[PDB]
């Protein structure tokens, strides 16, 4: 089954230059159509345009003539510039197939470009300790707090992906002073504390950031 | 560009009832080769829209028999003859008859389930972060319904304001509840200069506001 997979920097200043690039598994490119879409903000969908049979192309008018799409056939992948940007082009860019009856049959996971002149930075992690105070009939609450960060998006799991059952990672909230803060949190049973070990695992791969939390009482 | 433009915006349903969503283009979505490439999507929280429908009335793969499109030239109708707390998410409908492709502005659906109470929790500040000058303090509203919910912080009594920042989950798919969290931050100093923190909550499921505090050390 076909699966795409976009990849580039998640951070581009006005004015500057757009470049992304979806890597395909399990088909090759060299037939069939392949698409980028993008989605601002709780915002909805827009086609940016296709890469088809010969190196053909078609860009959506409302681009303005600022996008471009070309391919690498040897490495199964195409990309996506779009030049002059602006906040407006802050969004997730998806890359997808087309079908034969032309609609957009599977997609990549996005990956988000924020536009903006401000710099990178990695965030702290604090942790949200369980307590009396997070703790009601069996229950008890913890979490990480992570702090300070720019651009989005930060991802969370916790013990390597072991525990999934009760993790709520809230969405970022855009702090004044236009950094990033989120936090993660697992309802887990308080008769497990102190018997079971919970770890955040958190990654910010704008800043490099890859940082693991052990969170106790 | 064909715009295409859907009916509700916004589309709350009770489980096991059904639910109808409009779709128009402002031109025939005929096209010369005689198919109508009108097409849906499903975008579900946090992850990429999903081919639903295609070709008007068309099921994708592993779309469930609920689900049924149906219309011509340029009316369009998606119907769910029974909603399941999995369908909850964002439903577009797309033209592909004509370029540039475009979407619909996006319905979402939500999940009318029973009334439920926010278990409450709050996190002082870590001493990790009490070292950086600044104060975090976090208020964890767990798996409630309805959306409607309103935190306030009260700092030795004193009602806070502009200082705090809440952010909440989409409609969780399996039990259609939401969660919130609401992080109130001061500096170390403030932080120091006061003695009893506490969030208190408000919501229909609650038989009377709820109060979660704690005293500073």
């Known amino acids: 089954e076909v699966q795409l997979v976009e990849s580039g920097p998640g951070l581009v200043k006005p004015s500057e230059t757009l470049s992304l690039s979806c890597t395909v598994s399990?088909?090759?490119?060299?037939?069939?159509?392949w698409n980028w879409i993008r989605q601002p903000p709780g915002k909805g969908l827009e086609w940016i345009g296709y890469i088809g049979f010969s190196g053909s192309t078609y860009y959506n008018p409302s681009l303005k003539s600022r996008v471009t799409i070309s391919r690498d056939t040897s490495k199964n992948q195409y990309s996506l510039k779009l030049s002059s940007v602006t906040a407006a082009d802050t969004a997730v860019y998806y890359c997808?197939?087309?079908?034969?009856?032309?609609?957009?049959?599977?997609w990549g996971q996005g990956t988000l470009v924020t536009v903006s002149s401000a710099s990178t930075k990695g965030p702290s992690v604090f942790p949200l300790a369980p307590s009396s105070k997070s703790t009601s009939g069996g229950t008890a609450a913890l979490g990480c707090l992570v702090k300070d960060y720019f651009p989005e998006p930060v991802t969370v799991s916790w013990n390597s992906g072991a525990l999934t059952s009760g993790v709520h990672t809230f969405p970022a909230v855009l702090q004044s002073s236009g950094l990033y803060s989120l936090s993660s949190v697992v309802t887990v049973p308080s008769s497990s504390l102190g018997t079971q070990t919970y770890i955040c695992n958190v990654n910010h791969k704008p800043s490099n950031t890859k940082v693991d939390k052990k969170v106790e009482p | 560009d064909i715009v295409m433009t859907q009916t509700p915006l916004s589309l709350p349903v009770t489980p096991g009832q059904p639910a109808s969503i409009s779709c128009r283009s402002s031109?025939?979505?005929?096209?010369?080769?005689?198919?109508?490439?009108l097409h849906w999507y499903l975008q579900k929280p946090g992850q990429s829209p999903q081919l639903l429908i295609y070709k008007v009335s068309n099921r994708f793969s592993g779309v469930p028999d609920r689900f049924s499109g149906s219309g011509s030239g340029t009316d369009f109708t998606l119907k769910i003859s029974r909603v399941e707390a999995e369908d909850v998410g964002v439903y577009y409908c797309?033209?592909?008859?004509?370029?540039?492709?475009?979407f619909g502005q996006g319905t979402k659906v939500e999940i009318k389930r029973t009334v439920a109470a926010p278990s409450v929790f709050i996190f002082p500040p870590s001493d990790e972060q009490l070292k950086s000058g600044t104060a975090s303090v976090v208020c964890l509203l767990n798996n409630f319904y309805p959306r409607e919910a309103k935190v306030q912080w009260k700092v030795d009594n004193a009602l806070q304001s502009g200082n705090s920042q809440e952010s909440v989950t989409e409609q969780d798919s399996k039990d259609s509840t939401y969660s919130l969290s609401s992080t109130l931050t001061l500096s170390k100093a403030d932080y120091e200069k006061h003695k009893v923190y506490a969030c208190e909550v408000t919501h229909q499921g609650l038989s009377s506001p709820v109060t979660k505090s704690f005293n500073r050390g």
């Open positions: 797309s033209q592909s008859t004509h370029v540039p492709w475009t």
């Open positions: 997808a197939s087309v079908d034969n009856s032309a609609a957009l049959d599977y």
């Open positions: 399990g088909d090759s490119i060299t037939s069939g159509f």
């Open positions: 031109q025939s979505l005929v096209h010369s080769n005689g198919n109508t490439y």
